[PDB]
Nucleic acid binder design. Structure first.
Ligand SMILES: [Mn+2]
Length: 276
DNA sequence: CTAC
DNA sequence: GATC
DNA sequence: GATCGGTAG
């Protein structure tokens, strides 16, 4: 009895039906993901907005099937300035966004196509793919420089309008957010410095982890599973994909979902419901 | 190979 | 990174 | 931890 995602709750705390649906998903290779029929699932889940991480489509050529999407006509991308088939994000929307900007306004963090900010009417949606510290924590010191700058950026956005941050935030916040908590203290993605940075972002903006708010004690819930050692089969995974919301968006919160059965990548999709 |  |  | 160990560009 490890983990099975509860039925979608399509109503806010006050009783109103969810008016918006945002789906985020790290695909570990866009093309490879489509080949694995990743669209068939998205077209099925038919989100109002689609956010993707690790697109790795730095050939200026995005798949054809993408233009064969009526519900996500308005599409925005952001790839690295100098790195082939690496990182890369994307944001597809049903309705048209008031304004869409890239990066975090910091020249040393805007070089790897990791951030896409989409400003709407009632809020601002930021999808992101956080810089991984790597093996042997080679880039740990840099990640720390990223985190601060990042939360500082978002704090200035929320100050003006409600924020919804979705995406691979690359970090299991508290122990309940991964299988082996004790066996990874020193592994990339669960360092004290990273964990602390996540707590920072949350209390500074401020923001609220959607799922960990609705499901306070639910364990064994994850969004990542290494392809090695058949990890997904044993549910030996991490929860690195979040939907952080401004506090004022909490009464608008209908449900935060984990699409565990959905295939096509080492990560699974997460979906949010908002009654706006 | 490399970063994941 | 999960294992032993 | 010493080892063994999946990946899309
Ligand atoms: Mn990945």
């Amino acid at each position: 009895a490890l983990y099975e995602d509860p039925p979608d709750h399509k109503t806010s705390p006050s009783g109103k039906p969810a008016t918006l649906k945002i789906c985020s998903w790290n695909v570990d290779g866009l093309r490879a993901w489509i080949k694995k029929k990743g669209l068939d699932w998205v077209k099925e889940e038919a989100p109002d907005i689609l956010c993707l991480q690790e697109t790795k489509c730095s050939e200026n050529k995005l798949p054809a099937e993408l233009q064969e999407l009526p519900g996500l006509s308005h599409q925005y991308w952001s790839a690295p300035s100098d790195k082939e088939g690496y990182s890369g994000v994307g944001l597809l929307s049903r309705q048209c966004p008031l304004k869409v900007s890239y990066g975090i306004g910091d020249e040393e963090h805007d070089q790897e196509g990791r951030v896409i900010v989409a400003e709407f009417d009632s809020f601002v949606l930021v999808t992101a793919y956080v810089p991984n510290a790597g093996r042997g924590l080679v880039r740990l010191e840099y990640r720390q420089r990223w985190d601060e700058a990042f939360r500082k950026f978002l704090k200035g956005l929320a100050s003006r309008k409600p924020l919804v941050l979705c995406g691979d935030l690359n970090v299991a916040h508290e122990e309940i957010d991964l299988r082996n908590p004790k066996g990874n203290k020193k592994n990339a993605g669960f360092t004290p410095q990273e964990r602390q940075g996540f707590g920072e972002l949350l209390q500074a903006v401020p923001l609220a982890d959607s799922f960990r708010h609705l499901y306070p004690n639910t364990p064994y819930a994850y969004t990542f599973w290494t392809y090695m050692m058949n990890a997904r089969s044993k549910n030996v995974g991490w929860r690195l994909d979040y939907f952080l919301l401004s506090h004022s968006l909490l009464p608008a919160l209908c449900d935060s979902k984990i699409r565990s059965k959905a295939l096509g990548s080492d990560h699974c999709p997460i979906t949010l419901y908002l009654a706006l």
